[PDB]
């Protein structure tokens, strides 16, 4: 088929995903270059919703300059009916890539962590705490991870789901405060999965015994032993249940694990 964004024309190759009321497509331009265009339908969007979108769109536009661990946004068209965003295309998101993976080259892993750490640090420098990080927020592109979203009334799924609640930090649960250390807990959980093949509370079906466990210090998390003692440490340092005890992004960047060898 086909479509138009700011005059320029793109032919559709396939849909990649859906959610909210928005599709993401892979597409080709006039020069046969490949891109990803996200379409959002605003016909049922309240004013709040709409401001949240203008808000992420602006933050993404801005943070482009500051890191290449953020997804490139090349162009966009915005009206009262719809938004189109022309973006750089990934090969696969990280949730899907980790679903269909048997085990991880410990090098690839350290390299991904480096990427995650850079990207999340970046949004923190600009005032943003994501507070709902999952692997699905990360997209793989030339062997690099790039962060896709930041915080909106936002939801995506390829064609796992959302809410999930295995990356959720204690303080987000006690809230019924949130801060940068919240993004360390979630990043820790992701790294734990990339390390032990599951998330720390993954094997607790009952959604409520899971929430109770996350906030309960007497419930101790198992950190089985491994050749990379450092990796074991980082994990213990990210998964402190008290934010004040938890390590920080600038500290993680200086940590032996991402620095040594
Ligand atoms: C081409 C491609 C295929 C996939 N999949 C490969 C098969 O497994 C699930 C979908 C995932 C991401 C991408 N590339 C790709 N994907 C995106 N995905 C969005 C839409 C659906 C869930 C992940 C978030 C992109 N957003 C901005 N630029 C993107 N570039």
């Amino acid at each position: 088929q086909s479509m138009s964004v700011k005059g320029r024309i793109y032919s559709i190759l396939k849909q990649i995903g859906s959610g909210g009321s928005s599709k993401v497509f892979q597409v080709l331009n006039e020069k046969k270059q490949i891109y990803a265009i996200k379409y959002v339908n605003l016909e049922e969007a309240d004013n709040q919703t709409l401001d949240s979108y203008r808000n992420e769109i602006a933050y993404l536009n801005k943070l482009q300059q500051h890191s290449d661990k953020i997804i490139r946004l090349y162009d966009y068209e915005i009206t009262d009916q719809y938004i189109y965003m022309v973006m750089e295309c990934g090969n696969i998101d990280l949730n899907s890539w980790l679903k269909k993976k048997k085990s991880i080259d410990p090098w690839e892993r350290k390299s991904y962590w480096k990427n995650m750490l850079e990207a999340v640090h970046t949004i923190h420098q600009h005032g943003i705490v994501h507070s709902d990080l999952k692997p699905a927020n990360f997209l793989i592109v030339d062997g690099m991870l790039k962060l896709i979203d930041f915080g909106i009334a936002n939801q995506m799924q390829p064609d796992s789901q959302v809410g999930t609640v295995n990356y959720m930090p204690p303080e987000a649960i006690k809230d019924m405060k949130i801060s940068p250390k919240s993004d360390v807990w979630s990043l820790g959980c992701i790294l734990y999965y990339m390390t032990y093949g599951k998330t720390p509370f993954q094997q607790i079906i009952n959604q409520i015994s899971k929430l109770h466990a996350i906030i309960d210090p007497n419930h101790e998390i198992e950190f089985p032993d491994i050749p990379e003692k450092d990796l074991q440490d980082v994990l213990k340092c990210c998964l402190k249940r008290d934010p004040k005890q938890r390590i920080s992004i600038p500290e993680l960047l200086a940590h032996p694990y991402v620095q040594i060898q």
Side-chain angles (χ1 to χ4, degrees), residues 204-218:
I204 304 184
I205 342 89
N206 178 224
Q207 211 88 226
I208 289 174
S209 272
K210 192 173 262 167
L211 298 181
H212 285 306
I214 281 163
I215 59 192
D216 167 28
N218 303 325

Side-chain angles (χ1 to χ4, degrees), residues 150-168:
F150 309 168
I152 264 181
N154 203 348
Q155 202 173 199
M156 286 291 169
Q157 47 161 320
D159 64 333
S160 294
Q161 272 320 78
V162 278
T164 183
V165 79
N166 291 293
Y167 306 88
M168 197 147 193

Side-chain angles (χ1 to χ4, degrees), residues 5-243:
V5 174
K6 283 288 212 169
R8 307 198 189 285
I9 307 89
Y10 308 79
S11 64
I12 303 189
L13 301 192
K14 39 166 189 159
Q15 168 156 333
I16 295 158
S18 64
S21 76
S22 71
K23 295 180 182 297
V24 191
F25 310 104
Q26 189 176 43
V27 310
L28 280 164
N29 68 332
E30 294 135 345
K31 310 264 79 173
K32 308 304 198 158
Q33 289 164 295
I34 194 167
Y35 290 99
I37 290 184
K38 167 178 181 171
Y39 157 81
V40 185
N41 177 56
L42 311 170
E43 295 302 320
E44 305 195 2
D46 56 71
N47 270 280
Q48 293 177 335
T49 297
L50 270 181
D51 262 286
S52 92
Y53 297 175
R54 289 172 193 122
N55 200 239
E56 187 158 314
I57 284 161
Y59 273 116
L60 176 55
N61 197 11
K62 207 220 192 304
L63 295 188
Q64 286 229 73
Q65 274 66 26
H66 295 77
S67 183
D68 65 331
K69 303 318 180 278
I70 309 226
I71 190 150
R72 268 68 218 89
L73 169 65
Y74 294 105
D75 205 357
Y76 62 83
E77 180 172 306
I78 174 164
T79 72
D80 300 312
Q81 290 61 54
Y82 62 82
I83 303 161
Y84 292 131
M85 310 179 214
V86 177
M87 299 168 73
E88 162 186 51
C89 196
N91 322 125
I92 189 167
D93 70 282
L94 184 74
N95 198 35
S96 301
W97 187 79
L98 289 181
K99 294 295 153 187
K100 62 185 65 166
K101 188 91 189 201
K102 26 65 166 83
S103 63
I104 322 184
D105 170 13
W107 186 96
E108 213 181 358
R109 173 165 59 216
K110 181 174 298 205
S111 169
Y112 284 163
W113 187 241
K114 281 186 179 153
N115 292 174
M116 272 167 275
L117 282 178
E118 192 181 322
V120 172
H121 193 213
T122 303
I123 65 178
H124 284 184
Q125 283 174 338
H126 295 83
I128 305 156
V129 169
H130 193 302
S131 72
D132 194 45
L133 283 165
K134 319 161 282 284
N137 298 134
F138 295 93
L139 191 64
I140 313 203
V141 195
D142 312 319
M144 296 165 59
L145 296 200
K146 299 210 189 189
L147 175 74
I148 303 167
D149 84 318
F150 309 168
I152 264 181
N154 203 348
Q155 202 173 199
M156 286 291 169
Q157 47 161 320
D159 64 333
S160 294
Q161 272 320 78
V162 278
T164 183
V165 79
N166 291 293
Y167 306 88
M168 197 147 193
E171 58 271 29
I173 294 157
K174 295 168 210 173
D175 225 49
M176 342 320 186
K177 281 299 311 309
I178 279 76
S179 97
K181 302 304 192 66
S182 295
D183 293 329
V184 188
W185 177 280
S186 318
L187 292 181
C189 294
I190 284 167
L191 177 65
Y192 191 103
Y193 185 91
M194 294 183 83
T195 290
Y196 299 128
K198 47 145 203 160
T199 63
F201 307 83
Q202 191 169 297
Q203 24 65 234
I204 304 184
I205 342 89
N206 178 224
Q207 211 88 226
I208 289 174
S209 272
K210 192 173 262 167
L211 298 181
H212 285 306
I214 281 163
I215 59 192
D216 167 28
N218 303 325
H219 194 295
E220 294 183 15
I221 301 176
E222 204 176 301
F223 300 85
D225 303 345
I226 30 169
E228 290 192 278
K229 290 289 183 284
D230 286 324
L231 186 37
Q232 202 179 340
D233 182 53
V234 174
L235 293 170
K236 292 188 178 189
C237 276
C238 298
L239 300 164
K240 293 294 186 203
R241 281 194 181 74
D242 173 32

